[PDB]
Design a protein around this ligand. Structure first.
Ligand SMILES: Nc1ncnc2c1ncn2[C@@H]1O[C@H](COP(=O)(O)OP(=O)(O)OP(=O)(O)O)[C@@H](O)[C@H]1O
Ligand SMILES: [Ca+2]
Ligand SMILES: [Ca+2]
Ligand SMILES: [Ca+2]
Lengths: 371, 307
C-alpha cells in the first residue's frame, strides 16, 4: 500500500515513507563491534551494535561504515543497516512495502544488482526501484535539467542532468567530503595549539565546523584580512566552559573543496570540476546547466558557498552567460524528499521492478529498468 | 518500462493544447474553458502539439510553477514532464516556466492572455551505553549436548563468553563433526585463534548440516581464515560466514587468496568481512552474486514445474 523511501549515504541513513515531507529516521550509518583492546560482557549474545546504539557506545567499539565514498563496500553490514532501518526504526514488515532505494551516480553495475538481489531474497519486498541521488535532488528542486553539486559526509559529485537524466560521461567525482573536512579542521586547529585527537574531541571539532566554518568569497583576500585584524575571528565555548577564539581556520577548512591540494589531493576544485563537467556536455545544453546549479547534501551548508560558486563559475564561463546557484534550505534532505515525491506519484506503480519480474529475469533486470 | 495512465493515453494525439494540473501527486486535466487561468499556489504541465508535414507531431512540454506552489507539486510537475516526454519517445522539448519569468512562446499560447489567480489545491504531503544481560549458555552442558546429537539444539551461541579454553573450542569443532542438528554456530569475541580455525576447517569438510558460522572479533589470522576457505572446497552446505574484526588484519595476499579460493565454491551466499582492497572486494561480491542467482535459477525451474 504505502511505499518506503531509503536514502543510504556514507555517513547517514535517511529513511521514511513516501508522501511524507521528511524522513522518519535519520541515523549514523555504522556498525560497531567490540574493541581490542577492551572488555565487554554487556553485549550479551550480540556480535554487533548498529545505528544510534553503536554511536552511543563509540567509546568501547571500533566503528565501521558499510558505505564508502557513497558506494557500498561492506555488504554484510549493509544488510544489517537495512534490517535495522525496516524493523527497528520504521517498524515495518518490508515484504509489505514497495521500496525505493538510492545510489551514487557512477555506482558500479554489479552493486546495483546485489542491492536488487538482497532486497528480494533477504527482505522479500514486493517491489523495488533504485534512483540516482543527485537526480532526485534536481527533481525536489522542480527541475528536469540542471547540474547538481552533491556533497555529503563521504563523497562529492558533479552531476549534469538533461530532460530528466544524468549524463554519465560528464559526471565528475571527488572523494573529499565532510568527514575528511572534519579531520582537516582537527589538524589546523591543532597546529594552532588546541590538540584534538580524542574519540570525543573529534566530536567537538565536528560541531565547530558545522557552526563556525564558511566559504570565503576570495581566499587570499580573506587570508589578508584575517592577518591584519580580528574581524573574522569568532569565539567558541567548549564543554569544559572555556571560551576560545578561532581564526582563519573557519574558511581554510572548506577551502579544501575548491583547493584539494590543502589535504594532499591532486584533484581539481569543485568549481573547476563543475566547469569541466558542463564542458563535457553538448554545447546546446550548457546554457541550461549554467543557469541551474543546484546544491544538495550537508557539506553544501557552509555559509558563503553559493556566492563563491557564482563567482568562480562566472570567471570560467563566457562573458555573457547567465549563471545561477540554487541552494535550497532543506538540502540536507533533498535526495530523500525527491524520492518521497517520485514514489508517491500515480504514475509510479508501473516503474517498480516486481518480485515476479525479478524471479523470472534475474537482477540484470535493474540495468534495463533503472537508468 | 514506461508509464501508462489515462491522461498519458490522451496526450499528444493531435494538434492543440493540453493543460494538466498536479493535484495530490496525480496529473489532472484542466477544464478547457479554464485555460490560461493559473493558480499561483499550484503547478502545471502544458503540452503543445503541432502537425508536421510528414503527418507526425512536434511536441513542446512546459511545466508551470506557481510562486506559492508547494514542493511536492513542483517536484511532481518536473517528473511528470519527464515521464510524459519518455512516453512520447523523447521527442518533446522540455521547458521550465516560472511565474513572472515565462517564455514568450509559452505566453503566446493564450490568445486571450495569461491570468494569475491566488490559491490552489492543497499539498499532497503529509539512549543507553555499555552493559546489558550477559550470555548464559553453559559451555560444558552444550558441548555435551552436541556429542549426543541432541535435536533440541539447532543453534549454538558462544558470543562474548570470556575465558573459554582453546582445546574446548577445538572440542566443539570435533563435536560438531558428525552433528546433523546444528545449523548455526556463533563464537564471536571468544579470543579464538588459528588452532580453533584449523579445527573448524577440518570440521567443515565432514559436516553437512551447519549453514552459518560466526568468527567475528577473534584472534584468527590469515592462515586460519584461509584454511577455512580451502575447506569450503569440500563443503556445499555453508551459506554464511563472518570473520569481521579480527585483532590483526590479514593483508592483501590473504584477500587475494580468499577471492581466488571462492571461485570454485558454488554454495556460500554471504561473507562478513571488511576488505581493504576493492579488487578482491568486487570479485567476491560478483561470486556471491552468482551463487545467489543459482538459488534463483533452481527456484524458477522449481516454479516452472507445477503447471
Ligand atoms: N551545517 C553544516 N555545515 C557543514 N557540514 C555539515 C553541516 N551539517 C551537516 N554537515 C555534514 O553533512 C554530512 C551529512 O550530509 P548527507 O547526509 O548529505 O551525507 P551522506 O549522504 O551521509 O554522505 P554522502 O552523500 O557522501 O554519502 C556530514 O558530513 C556532516 O558533517
Ligand atoms: Ca548522500
Ligand atoms: Ca498547491
Ligand atoms: Ca526530449
Amino acid at each position: 500500500t504505502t511505499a518506503l523511501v531509503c536514502d543510504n549515504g556514507s555517513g547517514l541513513v535517511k529513511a521514511g515513507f513516501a508522501g511524507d515531507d521528511a524522513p522518519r529516521a535519520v541515523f549514523p550509518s555504522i556498525v560497531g563491534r567490540p574493541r581490542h583492546q577492551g572488555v565487554m560482557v554487556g553485549m550479551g549474545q550480540k556480535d554487533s551494535y548498529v545505528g544510534d546504539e553503536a554511536q552511543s557506545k563509540r567509546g568501547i567499539l571500533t566503528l565501521k561504515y558499510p558505505i564508502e565514498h557513497g558506494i557500498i563496500t561492506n555488504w554484510d553490514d549493509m544488510e544489517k543497516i537495512w534490517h535495522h532501518t525496516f524493523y527497528n526504526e520504521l517498524r515495518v514488515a518490508p515484504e509489505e512495502h514497495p521500496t525505493l532505494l538510492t545510489e551514487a551516480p557512477l555506482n558500479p553495475k554489479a552493486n546495483r544488482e546485489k542491492m536488487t538481489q538482497i532486497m528480494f531474497e533477504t527482505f522479500n519486498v514486493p517491489a523495488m526501484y533504485v534512483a540516482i541521488q543527485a537526480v532526485l535532488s534536481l527533481y525536489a528542486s522542480g527541475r528536469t535539467t540542471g547540474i547538481v553539486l552533491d556533497s555529503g559526509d563521504g563523497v562529492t559529485h558533479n552531476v549534469p542532468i538533461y530532460e530528466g537524466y544524468a549524463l554519465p560521461h560528464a559526471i565528475m567525482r571527488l572523494d573529499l567530503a565532510g568527514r575528511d573536512l572534519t579531520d582537516y579542521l582537527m589538524k589546523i586547529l591543532t597546529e594552532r595549539g588546541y590538540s584534538f585527537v580524542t574519540t570525543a574531541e573529534r566530536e567537538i571539532v565536528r560541531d565547530i565546523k558545522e557552526k563556525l566554518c564558511y566559504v570565503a568569497l576570495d581566499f587570499e583576500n580573506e587570508m589578508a584580512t584575517a592577518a591584519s585584524s580580528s574581524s573574522l575571528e569568532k569565539s567558541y565555548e567548549l564543554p569544559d566552559g572555556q571560551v576560545i577564539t578561532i581564526g582563519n581556520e573557519r574558511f581554510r577548512c572548506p577551502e579544501t573543496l575548491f583547493q584539494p591540494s590543502f589535504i594532499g589531493m591532486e584533484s581539481a576544485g569543485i568549481h573547476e570540476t563543475t566547469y569541466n563537467s558542463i564542458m563535457k556536455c553538448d554545447i546546446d545544453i550548457r546554457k541550461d546547466l549554467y543557469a541551474n546549479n543546484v546544491m544538495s547534501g550537508g557539506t553544501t551548508m557552509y555559509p558563503g558557498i553559493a556566492d563563491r560558486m557564482q563567482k568562480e563559475i562566472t570567471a570560467l564561463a563566457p562573458s555573457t552567460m547567465k549563471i545561477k546557484i540554487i541552494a535550497p534550505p532543506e538540502r540536507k534532505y533533498s535526495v530523500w524528499i525527491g524520492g518521497s515525491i517520485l514514489a508517491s506519484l500515480s504514475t509510479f506503480q508501473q516503474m517498480w521492478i516486481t518480485k515476479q519480474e525479478y524471479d523470472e529475469a534475474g537482477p540484470s533486470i535493474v540495468h534495463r529498468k533503472c537508468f | 518500462m514506461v508509464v501508462e495512465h489515462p491522461e498519458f493515453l490522451k496526450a499528444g494525439k493531435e494538434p492543440g493544447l493540453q493543460i494538466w494540473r498536479v493535484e495530490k501527486f496525480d496529473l489532472v486535466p484542466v477544464p478547457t474553458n479554464l485555460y490560461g487561468d493559473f493558480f499561483t499556489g499550484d503547478a502545471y504541465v502544458i503540452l503543445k502539439t503541432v502537425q508536421l508535414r510528414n503527418g507526425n507531431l512536434q511536441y513542446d512540454l512546459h511545466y508551470w510553477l506557481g510562486n506559492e506552489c508547494s514542493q511536492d507539486e513542483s517536484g511532481a510537475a518536473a517528473i511528470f514532464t519527464v515521464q510524459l516526454d519518455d512516453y512520447l519517445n523523447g521527442r518533446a522539448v522540455q521547458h521550465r516556466e516560472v511565474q513572472g519569468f515565462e517564455s514568450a512562446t509559452f505566453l503566446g499560447y493564450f490568445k486571450s492572455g495569461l491570468k494569475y489567480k491566488k490559491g490552489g489545491v492543497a499539498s499532497g504531503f503529509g539512549k543507553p551505553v555499555p552493559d546489558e544481560e550477559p550470555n548464559s549458555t553453559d559451555v560444558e552442558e552444550t558441548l555435551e549436548r552436541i556429542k549426543n546429537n541432541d535435536p533440541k539444539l539447532e543453534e549454538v551461541n558462544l558470543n562474548n563468553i570470556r575465558n573459554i579454553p582453546i582445546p574446548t573450542l577445538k572440542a566443539y569443532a570435533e563435536a560438531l563433526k558428525e552433528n546433523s542438528y546444528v545449523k548455526k554456530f556463533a563464537l564471536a569475541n571468544t579470543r579464538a585463534d588459528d588452532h580453533v580455525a584449523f579445527a573448524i576447517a577440518i570440521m567443515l569438510k565432514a559436516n553437512k548440516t551447519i549453514t552459518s558460522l560466526n568468527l567475528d572479533s577473534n584472534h584468527i589470522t590469515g592462515k586460519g581464515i584461509l584454511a577455512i576457505f580451502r575447506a569450503l572446497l569440500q563443503n556445499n552446505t555453508l551459506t554464511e560466514l563472518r570473520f569481521h574484526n579480527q585483532r590483526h588484519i590479514c593483508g592483501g595476499k590473504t584477500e587475494m587468496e580468499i577471492a581466488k579460493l571462492l571461485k570454485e565454491n558454488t554454495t556460500l551466499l554471504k561473507l562478513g568481512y571488511h576488505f581493504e582492497l576493492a579488487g578482491p572486494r568486487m570479485t567476491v561480491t560478483n561470486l556471491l552474486s552468482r551463487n545467489m542467482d543459482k538459488q534463483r535459477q533452481k527456484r524458477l525451474q522449481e516454479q516452472r514445474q507445477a503447471q
